[PDB]
Amino acid sequence: QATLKDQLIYNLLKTPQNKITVVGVGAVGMACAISILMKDLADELALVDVIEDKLKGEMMDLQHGSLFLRTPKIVSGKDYNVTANSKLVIITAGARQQEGESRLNLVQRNVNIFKFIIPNVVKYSPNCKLLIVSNPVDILTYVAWKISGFPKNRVIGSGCNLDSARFRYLMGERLGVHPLSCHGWVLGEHGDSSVPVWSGMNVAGVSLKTLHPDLGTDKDKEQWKEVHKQVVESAYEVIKLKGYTSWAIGLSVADLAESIMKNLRRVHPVSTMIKGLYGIKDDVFLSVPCILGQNGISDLVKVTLTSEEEARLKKSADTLWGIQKELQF
Amino acid sequence: TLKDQLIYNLLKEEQTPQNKITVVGVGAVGMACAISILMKDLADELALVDVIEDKLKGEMMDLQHGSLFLRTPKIVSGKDYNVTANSKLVIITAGARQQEGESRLNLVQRNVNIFKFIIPNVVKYSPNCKLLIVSNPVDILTYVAWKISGFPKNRVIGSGCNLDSARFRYLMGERLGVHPLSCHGWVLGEHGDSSVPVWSGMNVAGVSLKTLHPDLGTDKDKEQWKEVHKQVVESAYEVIKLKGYTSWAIGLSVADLAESIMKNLRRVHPVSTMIKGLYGIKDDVFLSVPCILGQNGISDLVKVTLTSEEEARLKKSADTLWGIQKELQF
Amino acid sequence: ATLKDQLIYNLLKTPQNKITVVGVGAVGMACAISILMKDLADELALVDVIEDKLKGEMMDLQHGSLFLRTPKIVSGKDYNVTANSKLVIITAGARQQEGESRLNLVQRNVNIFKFIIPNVVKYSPNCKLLIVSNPVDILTYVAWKISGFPKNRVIGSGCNLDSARFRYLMGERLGVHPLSCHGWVLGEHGDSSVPVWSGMNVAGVSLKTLHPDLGTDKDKEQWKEVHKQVVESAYEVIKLKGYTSWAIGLSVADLAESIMKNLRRVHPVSTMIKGLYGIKDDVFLSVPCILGQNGISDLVKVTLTSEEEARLKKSADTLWGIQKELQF
Amino acid sequence: ATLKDQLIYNLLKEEQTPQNKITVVGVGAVGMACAISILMKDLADELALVDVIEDKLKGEMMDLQHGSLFLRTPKIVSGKDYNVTANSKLVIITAGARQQEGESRLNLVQRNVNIFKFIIPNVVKYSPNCKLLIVSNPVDILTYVAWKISGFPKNRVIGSGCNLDSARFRYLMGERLGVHPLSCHGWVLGEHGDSSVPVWSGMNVAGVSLKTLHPDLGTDKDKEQWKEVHKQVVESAYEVIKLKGYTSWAIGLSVADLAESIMKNLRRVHPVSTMIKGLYGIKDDVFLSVPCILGQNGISDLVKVTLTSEEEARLKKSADTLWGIQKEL
Ligand SMILES: Cn1ccnc1C(=O)c1ccc(NC(=O)C[C@H](C(=O)O)c2ccc(C(F)(F)F)cc2)cc1
């Protein structure tokens, strides 16, 4: 007498190597999850949240699509033991930006949540890289770094990877070029104080501000400054229209995860400690271009900013530090 | 202007899109289809259409902001169906969706009404497209789309039991310790409560599970494999109870079908089509049988061998669906 | 200051998904390009003994790095470059000439393996060995005996390709993509391979049940000719272009995908089948195996008809007759 | 009833014209590398191969067909008759004499012009609406020749040009900087050959001009000898050919990169061979590489790269060299 399985299969053999955990199964977390699944970045995906039904429903929905994926193990749970041995833990949990609301208003509430999340993550994946997505992402990357005790190369904020992607899309819409071939960087706060690096914007290595010196100024008859205003307002407008943002940030996060998981050493504008650059003296985290790989941030790229750009980046650091210094944890 | 100093134009002749896909409906199902199609590089232009103008624009913008990470260079939206012109494939997901405990068949009046306005507008602007119906009850709405469009039935395809079969193969794989890709088994009939598990065709590596386990699919089964089908039937209800709706699996299922159509693969999928003439069925009933899918839609039907009980269940599903289809007026 | 140090502030002074391909002949390079375009490795190492071809192939792949997502492509004539591999793919050795049987390669390629396998194993002691060189079933046995690895980690590419060819030919006959044409070729990757007619199906419909004479000498449709074309495929391609490469490279990348991504998909690969069908010796040939990050985790016990089982035992006798004459 | 007829009920009796058909002309090493790269990127729903060596053509076709289970291109065909190429959207020409050890690409010009007099009219006859992608060498001159013979508008006659040279440049840049080539930006323009031009003034990482940081970059006084990078670009093909007998993989991937931009209408910027009359002081009908926007109509636009006087003179010299050959045909 033998069961079906035992008549069909002779068992020979009785840890995951490319495991990714997503913390938070709100819209941002689930868009990160689906993007990472469709890019075949992980051999195991773990989801963690505190709403048990929603967590199970999202896990089941993904699992029902397994035939169409190449990620063979999808698990979930409220207990962080399900996250054990992750290479990469993506934290998207916490309060999310609402209509008309500054991401900076979320800071203390999400700091309080990180006091619980981060130690549990570190307990079960002491060797992982942390990719912070929750907002305000720059301050929460600082907080995650402080709580975790990790070296700062392994604490990465998704930062302005998305703002720069939005900038390159809008740039491409004006020039009739795919964003892949429109190069431009948004640095600083992932938020209202972000900094467009007009002096570096280029197609095929041609500096656009060299052709158009008014680029980025008020006197600009083409009003390129509106491009950056649209970058700043983008999240507010999408939130007002559909209630939240999800797809673009999910793709941005999966882009960062690809560079990390595959050790690509591509350059991304992500949140990291900038103390000692551009005359900044405090432990401020904000986005500068960094080399990203399997050890996290291995190097910073020292971008040459104009005086006007450097002043705006300092203003961004001052805004963040004004909030950072008043946190207790 | 800066653009003219930077760029020398050779020609400004904009041509018709070559691989355009439209998604009608920007609810959770429609957006899951859209992101799945975008990340599989199946379209060179994606159009979104719906009646909720704010949500439509917000979803469009959110996808557009991810363009750097995609290889689909044009993403458009509008309430006017002129944005959908010259689509190769139009995926209809709009309509009411089932609440907790609610049958897909309770959606008929609401979504037939919506289709009576959607389909003529789609056909007006993409007269050569394939219609991929996802809205529920999908088998009845595929019938409806066929009647209203006037298209040949090869170009009217219901997403049908592609998802039920995927779920079945997932649950098979969990029981056997095998990836669903290597677990073969078909759920046919209604995408709903009357679906039919084809026990006689379930296999791994060409080994019939029913041959090894003759009680498979019966009440005397000490392993209770019928509970696997029951889980398939209940899957959407359980997910809806937990997260309020389903989206990711159906989106991946639809992108799977769209891949076969857009790349002319001639893969076999269980999709909603007219099965008149099969198993001595004489009415124009639409339900899922395995179909060869390619760039012209359904090119062939596979004549699955069914046991007596399997065929009786399929006829019961056909009777349930036809009981509803026959009372529809066009 | 150097340009690099002016541009880059450094913060930080082993590969996690490394694949090595041994042999940079046409088969090895087809495996390499297929693996690279499937993004299966974060480091790819090429090893061979022909210094010039090796460096030339390495440089050619590197020059395409902008279009790939594998950031480290290395090569060498020594094993330093292979250290810490998850998967080592062995394609080196003599290949069959026009009209030459794969079994005629035994002496030459067994000799090569007695040098390659002991060294490979020293520097990647945890890798899976994927044998592609021919005769692959005999050489998988050799690699297992020599390496000291447990058998789950010594895998021959086997009949994965014969089955792919069978399903392609099936699909041409039936008007269906090979992905939807299901049928297995087992046994020797060679002239004694066994088509499992009794399992061939589309959408779970048994073709033999529809056509009980399928694949016999009574078959009016002559489906046996489909398997004959499978057996003869490599000979015909070698006669026409001199060698085969693309199909075997894609077949191997398919196996590497299942291993590297821990998919637990079923593939017909060369493994030890002692205990199946009453076979008593350490014969290696292809049966369907579940493939993942530990290599072969399970064997599928295919239900064979009397004639299919008899043909499989004939294949086993041919291989065993050669296997048992080898000394270690 | 036969087995097929017991199993399958045909609804459609015939197949429609292919919608995304690509033809590769020539099945030497370069042609087959293009074919496999295009197949593994899912760019075509039909691939046709043409050449004059009947046995090798059929063997290559069969070998690709035998891997069809692992691909998503359902029709692979071949023939000596160009009717097999009918209705291609893109025809890639790799046929003719290929560069040998020690051999200048320019030595191949007259032989390959002779071959194109037969190939191009046959291609045009069966695919009057295709784009032509010239890979055969010397690619710049043969792009000019294919344009004149075909009668096509120049937007539909594209030379693979310096897309590969630039990829090699960026690879070597990345090796020097420890950055993935995706994040190293730099253009090699002009002849796909010995007279190519490195645009030092445009090289950048994250929009930081390397020449601005390192003003000696590319000159003879350069203590870091970055000019050796371009020398390596120039010599790369010679070295690879000397080592393995030919080049194939990198050009195959480069062509598949161009084919992707064309087939998917991406409007990405690539340095490809086109007419540059009206730029940089060039008044002749010379074809050479400059950055072009590539899409479903082929080359729709050129990017007017800003050059130093020394870069511009080098590009004019490359143009003079090519024109001296072009005009003697
Ligand atoms: C002389 N004669 C007269 C009449 N019949 C005979 C035979 O000898 C004979 C002997 C055997 C068969 N067929 C099978 O063994 C099919 C096999 C099974 O049934 O296990 C099966 C494999 C795979 C699948 C699935 F699910 F994968 F598709 C389903 C079923 C047919 C005729």
- DSSP string for residues in D175-206: HHHTS-GGG-B--EEB-SSTT-EE-GGG-EET
Question: Among D181, A279, A155, A303, which residue's Cα sits nearest to residue C11?
Answer: A155
Burial of A266 (0-12, 13-18, 19+ CB in 10 A): buried
| Radius of gyration of the CA atoms of chain B, in A | 21
Relative to the CA of B201, which ligand 1 atom is closest? 26
Check whether C161 is labelled as a binding-site residue: no
Encode C231-262: b = buried (16+ Cβ within 10 Å), e = exposed: bebbbebbebbebbbbbbbbbbbbbbbbbbbb
Q: How many CB atoms within 10 Å of residue A5?
A: 18
Q: Are strands A206-207 and A202-203 parallel, antiparallel or unpaired?
A: antiparallel
CA distance C4 to D176: 8
B291: left (phi over 0), alpha (psi -120 to 50) or beta: beta
Question: Among D87, D84, D108, which residue's Cα sits nearest to residue D97?
Answer: D108
Alpha-helix residue ranges (DSSP H) falling in chain D: 3-7, 29-40, 54-66, 109-126, 139-150, 163-177, 210-213, 227-244, 249-263, 309-326
CA distance B286 to B320: 11
* Domains, in order of start, for chain C: 18-156 (3.40.50.720), 160-323 (3.90.110.10)
What is the residue with the minimal CA distance to atom 26 of ligand 1?
B201
Residue A188: DSSP 8-state: B
Closest Cα in chain B, distance from residue A54 (Å): 5
Q: Which residues neighbour A151 within 8 Å (Cβ) at sequence distance 6 or greater?
A: none
Distances (CA, A) of C203 to A217, D43, D240: 64, 28, 49
What strands, in cross-sheet order, belong to the sheet with A73-77? A73-77, A44-48, A19-23, A88-91, A129-132, A155-157, A266-273, A285-293, A296-301, C8-10
Question: Among B185, B178, A69, which residue's Cα sits nearest to residue C266?
Answer: B178
Burial of D8 (0-12, 13-18, 19+ CB in 10 A): buried
Chain D touched by C71 (CB under 8 Å): yes
Question: Among A84, A70, A265, A269, which residue's Cα sits nearest to residue A163?
Answer: A269
B199 CA → ligand 1 middle, Å: 15
Alpha-helix residue ranges (DSSP H) falling in chain A: 4-8, 27-38, 52-64, 107-124, 137-148, 161-175, 208-211, 225-242, 247-261, 307-324
H or E, element range at C292: strand C284-292
Q: Are C157 and C189 in contact (CB under 8 A)?
A: yes
Closest Cα in chain B, distance from residue A122 (Å): 28
Reduce the DSSP state of residue A289 to 3 states and report it.
strand
> What ranges make up the beta strands (E) of C192-283?
194-195, 201-202, 205-206, 265-272
Hey, are the CB atoms on D185 and A205 less than 8 Å from each other? Answer: yes
CA C184 to chain centre: 15
| Radius of gyration of the CA atoms of chain A, in A | 21
B292 CA → ligand 1 middle, Å: 23
Q: Are D206 and A200 in contact (CB under 8 A)?
A: yes
Reduce the DSSP state of residue B85 to 3 states and report it.
coil
H or E, element range at B90: strand B89-92
Residues 274-303 in C contacting B (C-alpha not used; CB under 8 Å): 288, 290, 298, 300-303
State the helix-helix crossing angle for B226-243 and A52-64, rounded to 10 degrees.
130
Find out whether the beta carbon of B290 lies less than 6 Å from any atom of ligand 1. no
Encode A133-151: b = buried (16+ Cβ within 10 Å), e = exposed: bbbbbbbbbbbbbbbbebe
CA distance A231 to A237: 10
Which member of C11, C16, C71 has the closest CB to residue A297? C11
List chain C gaps (C–N > 2.5 A) by preceding residue.
13
CA distance B194 to D73: 36
Q: Which residues neighbour C306 within 8 Å (Cβ) at sequence distance 6 or greater?
A: none
Residue C278 half-sphere exposure toward CB, CA atoms < 13 A: 5
H or E, element range at B47: strand B45-49
Reduce the DSSP state of residue B309 to 3 states and report it.
helix
Chain C residues in contact with D36 (beta carbon < 8 A): 30, 33-34, 246
Q: Are A130 and A121 in contact (CB under 8 A)?
A: yes
Encode B189-219: b = buried (16+ Cβ within 10 Å), e = exposed: bbbbebbbbbbbbbbbbbbbbbebbebbbee
Q: Of these residues, D192, D214, D230, D270, which one is catalytic?
A: D192
CA distance A11 to B178: 12
Report the amino acid identity of residue D62: M
Encode D56-93: b = buried (16+ Cβ within 10 Å), e = exposed: bbbbbbbbbbbbbbbbbbbbbbbbeebeebebbbbbbb
Q: Are A267 and A256 in contact (CB under 8 A)?
A: no
Find out whether the beta carbon of B206 lies less than 6 Å from any atom of ligand 1. yes
CA distance B228 to B187: 11
| In the block, residue with structure tokens 């590009």 | D315
State the helix-helix crossing angle for C160-174 and C246-260, rounded to 10 degrees.
110
Hey, are the CB atoms on B18 and D15 less than 8 Å from each other? Answer: no
Report the amino acid identity of residue B152: P
Chain D residues in contact with A177 (beta carbon < 8 A): 267-269, 293
**A288 strand-pairing partners:** A270
CA distance A135 to A105: 9
CA distance A9 to A70: 22
What is the residue with the minimal CA distance to atom 12 of ligand 1?
C209
Q: Are strands B203-204 and B297-302 parallel, antiparallel or unpaired?
A: unpaired
**B273 strand-pairing partners:** B287
CA distance B71 to B320: 43
Closest Cα in chain A, distance from residue D193 (Å): 21
Q: Are strands D46-50 and A44-48 parallel, antiparallel or unpaired?
A: unpaired
Closest Cα in chain B, distance from residue D268 (Å): 10
Distances (CA, A) of D11 to A30, B270, B306: 41, 16, 21
Hey, are the CB atoms on D217 and C173 less than 8 Å from each other? Answer: no
Burial of B45 (0-12, 13-18, 19+ CB in 10 A): buried
Chain A residues in contact with D268 (beta carbon < 8 A): 177-178, 180-181
CA B264 to chain centre: 17
Q: Are B136 and B98 in contact (CB under 8 A)?
A: yes
State yes or no: is D192 an active-site residue.
yes
Question: Which two tokens mark D319?
Answer: 């143009």
Q: Of these residues, A183, A190, A228, A268, which one is catalytic?
A: A190
Residues A166, A167, A171: CA angle, nearest 5 degrees: 120
Residues 221-250 in C contacting D (C-alpha not used; CB under 8 Å): 221, 223, 233, 236-242, 244-247, 249-250
CA distance B13 to B10: 9
Resolution of this model in Å is 1.9
Q: Which is it for the CA torsion C134, C137, C138, C143, positive or negative?
A: positive
Question: Among C36, C161, C32, which residue's Cα sits nearest to residue C88?
Answer: C32
CA distance C145 to C154: 10
Q: Are A313 and D218 in contact (CB under 8 A)?
A: no
Hey, are the CB atoms on D206 and A181 less than 8 Å from each other? Answer: no
Question: Among B193, B255, B199, B220, which residue's Cα sits nearest to residue B33?
Answer: B255
Q: Are strands A19-23 and A44-48 parallel, antiparallel or unpaired?
A: parallel
Structure determination technique employed: X-ray
Burial of A220 (0-12, 13-18, 19+ CB in 10 A): middle
- Phi, psi (degrees; rounded to nearest 5) at C177: -60, 145
